[PDB]
């Protein structure tokens, strides 16, 4: 076990001790990365990449702490983006200059009978909502919105009934995690998509009916720039044809498939997260993130290719740092009884890029 | 606020009942829970989520909720039980917590 | 093999799902509860890939349901039916 940092390459070596009462599964990141290494990675790099029951995010993977002895379970690519856009899809315009295009400003001259008229106006800094844009946010399949302030939530058992599901040959399957979508609107943290985000359990968590503080709920909020909010409608459509008799009618888009001109970010990867999945299509990138008796010792080595950060940004970045306060025990270390624990789920997106 | 009796009292051993009341949007919806505050210190949690209580708290203390009125019950009153008592609940109208007026317990 | 069954039947996922939202008895007060997704309940496990598009996956059926509105203390969670679904990343 160790790591070597050479230029754009990283060599991660992981050795564990196992016991067999079978297969080996190393597919989770914290197998190959210490927290410090993981930090050393995500802070300085814009992207990285390495050089059938595994892809189901099951247990039995090598323990994060190398001194842990574990049990073998019974058997039965492009650079991942690790950056946050510094611009939002709708704001790509120059704020100082009008577009030469025009939009429809006014359908009436005011209140009265037979006020029909057409007026047009320049799209410019004054009104940025209406400017024509070359690209649009990616697809969405709506998730129900659940609040971590529970009094807010409706008093009814909607856990299975209200959850977006896909049914296949008469069997119903919950949509989890689903298309990669922003977890929540800006400023609304307390909510979280029903099956929208990955949920990791804390060290020493009970198997069933655990409370909220026992689990760690990741959020994809970083991608809210290119991707729709998972709990909101992708937008509105025109549902009819207007006339002197009939008013315009719109409707909400609860689900929207790919269109020409959609750009999006995939779901993030985490220190606890899986690395790869076997492709059974479109955009093969797996939805949970990543890339598409006896005893003994086991080692594993993986070469990682890196994409360095070239930015000209003047002001300092948001960086991933270790908390500094007086505490009972060091995060990412052992307690007095000797139990290793991972207190916070760690993402990959800190450094920034233009859109 | 939550209407709550100013003071209740009893000799040691007698069951004492504190009951606070509120609107349907207030205590009728959601739940109640009880804090006991000894003079000069922070409050302490007796009963929470209407009828349940913490391990530290003694068996005699009891809780209940019926409609828009909830009530705390103390069985076997003791001298150590002389203190201030509040019932607390979320409020959907205000979107926050609401504290009932404090009730004092005096052993006779 | 079927798309949804690609999992190992013997082992739990380390992911969690929202098993129960009303823990109380009688009052049925709103609570958050989570459970390990595992061989006990296979419908809820998080899956890397989803079935391909459908225009009415069995063509005599709906592709699935989605949530229509925001739940609230006042409003129930309401789902609609997906009759047609275009391409989504991860479809096969």
């Amino acid at each position, epitope marked *: 076990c160790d790591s070597q940092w050479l230029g754009d390459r990283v060599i991660t070596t992981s050795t564990r001790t196992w016991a067999l009462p079978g297969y080996f599964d190393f597919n989770r990141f914290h197998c190959h990365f210490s927290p410090r290494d993981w930090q050393r990675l995500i802070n300085n790099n814009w992207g990285f990449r390495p050089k059938y029951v595994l892809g189901s995010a099951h247990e039995g993977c090598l323990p994060p702490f190398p001194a842990d002895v574990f049990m073998i379970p019974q058997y039965g690519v492009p650079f991942h983006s690790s950056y946050a856009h510094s611009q939002s899809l709708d704001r790509l315009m120059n704020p100082l200059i009008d577009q030469y295009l025009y939009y429809l400003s006014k359908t009436i001259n005011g209140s009265g009978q037979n006020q029909q008229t057409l007026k047009f106006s320049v799209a410019g800094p004054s009104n940025m909502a209406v400017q024509g844009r070359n690209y649009i946010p990616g697809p969405s399949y709506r998730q129900q919105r659940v609040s*971590t*302030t*529970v*009094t*807010q939530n409706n008093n009814s058992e909607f856990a299975w009934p209200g959850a977006s599901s896909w049914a296949l040959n008469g069997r119903n399957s919950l949509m989890n995690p689903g298309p990669a979508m922003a977890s929540h609107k800006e*400023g*609304e*943290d*307390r909510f979280f998509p029903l099956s929208g985000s990955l949920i990791f359990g804390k060290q020493g968590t009970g198997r069933d009916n655990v*409370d*909220a*503080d*026992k*689990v*760690m*709920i990741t*959020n994809e909020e970083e991608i809210k720039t290119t991707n729709p909010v998972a709990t909101e409608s992708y937008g509105q459509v025109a549902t009819n044809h207007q006339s002197a008799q009939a008013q315009a009618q719109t409707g909400w888009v609860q689900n929207q498939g790919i269109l020409p001109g959609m750009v999006w970010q995939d779901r993030d990867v985490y220190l606890q997260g899986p690395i790869w999945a076997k492709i059974p299509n479109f955009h093969p990138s797996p939805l949970m993130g990543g890339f598409g008796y006896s005893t003994g010792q086991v080692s594993v080595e993986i070469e990682w290719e890196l994409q360095k950060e070239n930015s000209k940004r003047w002001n300092p970045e948001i960086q991933y*740092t270790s*908390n*500094y*306060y*007086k*505490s*009972n025990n060091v*995060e990412f270390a052992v307690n007095t009884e000797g139990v290793y624990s991972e*207190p*916070r789920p760690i993402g990959t997106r800190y450094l920034t890029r233009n859109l | *606020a939550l209407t709550q009796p100013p003071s209740a009292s009893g000799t040691p051993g007698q069951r004492v009942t504190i009951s606070c009341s509120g609107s349907s949007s207030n205590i009728g919806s*959601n*739940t109640v*829970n009880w*804090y006991q505050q000894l003079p000069g210190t*922070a*409050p*302490k*949690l007796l009963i*929470f*989520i209407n009828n349940q209580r913490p391990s530290g708290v003694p068996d005699r203390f009891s809780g209940s909720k019926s409609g828009t009125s909830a009530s705390l019950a103390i069985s076997g009153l003791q001298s150590e039980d002389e203190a201030d008592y*509040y019932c*607390t609940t*979320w409020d959907g109208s*205000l*979107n*926050g*917590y*609401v*504290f*009932g*007026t*404090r009730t004092e317990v005096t052993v006779l | 093999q079927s798309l949804d069954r690609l999992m190992n039947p013997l082992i739990d996922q380390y992911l969690y799902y929202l098993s129960k939202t009303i823990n109380g008895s009688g009052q049925n007060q709103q*609570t*958050l509860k989570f459970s390990v997704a595992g061989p006990s309940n296979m419908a809820v496990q998080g899956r890397n890939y989803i079935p391909g598009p459908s225009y009415r996956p069995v063509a005599t059926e709906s592709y699935g349901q989605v949530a229509t509105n925001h739940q609230s203390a006042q409003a129930q969670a309401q789902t609609g039916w997906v009759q047609n679904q275009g391409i989504l990343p991860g479809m096969v």
Partner: nanobody
Amino acid sequence: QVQLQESGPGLVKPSETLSLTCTVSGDSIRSYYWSWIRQPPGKGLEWIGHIYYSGSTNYKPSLKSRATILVDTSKNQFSLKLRSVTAADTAVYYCAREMTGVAGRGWDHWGQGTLVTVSS
């Protein structure tokens, strides 16, 4: 183990901004709401507001626009700031932790509380 301690100037001149910080020690602030509740001397309790470790914020309606709550996860400390203070704001301010990681159901732990007096 979770220990809460409030710190702040014991004395504040009228119409000055009030500032308090609560530094939790021994346990992280992650996955838990945190609230300030106030008590005037010999009077009942008011709930100021609470904040969720990721920064979501809720206030007592009457008390908005004079109050602000911030959270610093790095320092693991948690702040209240209150403006345009008056003698009506002289009270003991408590730092409490919301229960079982979910907002709206009591407070599990309580700070020692600190007295703040508005006088000149």
